[PDB]
């Protein structure tokens, strides 16, 4: 087996910026022969197949934007993206076409950064539907905000929390950069129908205000 | 017109098999090698078996991590490449891709599939139960927002999630799934949209896809 070596695993660029990704292969891919090396780019956005940028060490696949470049031969190659845009968010794996096994590199994720956005958010009461079946699940939906880091506080009715709380980001939107994530407090029809003002509320390093989206009801 | 398609995936027990296919359409199938490449969850594109051009006999090769246990065939006749998986172990768990590995100066993977999720479980199956999500009239100040919640399924797999609905102003999310109690999964999925887009009395069909079965659909009131 032929190693190949990507770095840095992670960046974090504001677009219209320049990058540069390397990957080592702990063996040659050039021919003796032809002269050409045999190493393969793909890009890979978020639940999507890989698709072909650069093949021979520097081939730029048709189609591709002239932003996409990549240089090296023998065993260090990179990948320099001109001007850093939403749509690159991806990742980048190499790869040895050289032989088999054909083997990959660990990939190098590509995030925007981008000026703090502030969340909208949304409280679902449980469903009529599915009350009738023993849960109710009250949806908290917090949309469009930057950095993701960001903390939900589920105050049932008093103030309260808990282990009965599942949370979910979404990946970063190839438009604006911005995160979306759901909470959802799943309780039973009983518990649920016990307490009854419900309330959601988001502490972002935007505003100072934890940020709360309520609704009291559940006698209905 | 290069177009490779491939199919057979879901759940599995351990110890079980699978046939996966990869329908390949556009080209001459009987003289491309075709690469069979695995994507477990958190983890790197790891290459599998690989099929041959009736060109130097359709000889294969299998990485050590499967050598013994798949088989790689190809029904020339048909234009289908199947990988034929004996004795699956959770290690299993990933998206199974065919791919074209082209040659012309140098070799690369011109065309992949859209890939087919294998999951090796011993739980079992749990369709979701789609439930609406919609607001009292005292909840919406427009935009509107809707979505559906996709709950307590097995496995997760792929969940492809589209509505009824689209165009300019109107956005839909979907939110990974997440485990919860029971070794068991849900998901949302939220489309917001005009106001004058989604009235009254309307409703708005959410269609989720998974993995490999019917399509199940609700239709959720604005």
């Known amino acids: 087996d032929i190693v190949m070596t990507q770095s840095p695993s992670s960046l974090s660029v504001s677009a219209g910026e320049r990058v540069t990704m390397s990957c080592k292969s702990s063996?040659?891919?050039?021919?003796?022969?032809?002269?050409?090396?045999?190493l393969a780019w793909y890009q890979q956005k978020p639940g999507q197949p890989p698709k072909l940028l650069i093949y021979?060490?520097?081939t730029r696949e048709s189609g591709v934007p002239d932003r996409f470049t990549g240089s090296g031969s023998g065993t260090d190659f990179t990948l320099t993206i001109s001007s850093v845009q939403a749509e690159d968010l991806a990742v980048y794996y190499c790869?040895?076409?050289?032989?088999?096994?054909?083997?990959f590199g660990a990939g190098t994720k590509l995030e925007i950064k981008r000026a703090d956005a502030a969340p909208t958010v949304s409280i679902f009461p449980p469903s009529s539907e599915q009350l009738t079946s023993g849960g109710a699940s009250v949806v908290c939906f917090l949309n469009n905000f930057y950095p993701k880091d960001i903390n939900v506080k589920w105050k049932i009715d008093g103030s309260e929390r808990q282990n009965g709380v599942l949370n979910s980001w979404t990946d970063q939107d190839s438009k604006d950069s911005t995160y979306s994530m759901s909470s959802t407090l799943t309780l039973t029809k009983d518990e649920y129908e016990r307490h009854n003002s419900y309330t959601c509320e988001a502490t972002h390093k935007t505003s100072t205000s934890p940020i709360v989206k309520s609704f009291n009801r559940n006698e209905c | 017109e290069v177009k490779l398609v491939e199919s057979g995936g879901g759940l599995v027990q351990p110890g079980g098999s699978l046939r996966l296919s990869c329908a390949t359409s556009?080209?001459?199938?009987?003289?491309?090698?075709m690469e069979w490449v695995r994507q477990p969850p958190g983890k790197r594109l790891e290459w599998i078996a690989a099929?041959?051009?009736?060109?130097?006999?359709?000889?294969?090769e299998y990485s050590a991590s499967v050598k013994g246990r798949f088989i790689v065939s190809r029904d020339t006749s048909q234009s289908i490449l199947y990988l034929q998986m004996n004795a699956l172990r959770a290690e299993d768990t990933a998206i199974y891709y065919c791919?074209?590995?082209?040659?012309?100066?140098?070799?690369?993977?011109?065309?992949w599939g859209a890939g087919t999720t294998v999951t090796v479980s011993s739980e079992s199956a749990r369709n979701p139960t789609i439930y609406p999500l919609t607001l009292p009239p005292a909840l919406s100040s427009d935009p509107v927002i809707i979505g559906c919640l996709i709950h307590d399924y097995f496995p997760s797999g792929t969940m492809n999630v589209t509505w009824g609905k689209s165009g300019k102003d109107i956005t839909t999310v979907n939110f990974p799934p997440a485990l919860a109690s029971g070794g068991r999964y849900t998901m949302s999925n939220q489309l917001t949209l005009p106001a004058v887009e989604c009235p009254e009395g309307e409703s708005v069909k959410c269609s989720v896809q998974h993995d490999s079965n019917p399509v199940q659909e609700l239709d959720v009131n604005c």
């Open positions: 099929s041959r051009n009736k060109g130097n006999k359709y000889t294969t």
């Open positions: 790869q040895n076409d050289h032989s088999y096994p054909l083997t």
């Open positions: 791919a074209r590995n082209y040659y012309g100066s140098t070799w690369y993977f011109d065309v």
């Open positions: 556009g080209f001459t199938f009987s003289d491309f090698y």
């Open positions: 021979g060490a520097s």
């Open positions: 063996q040659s891919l050039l021919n003796s022969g032809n002269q050409k090396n045999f």
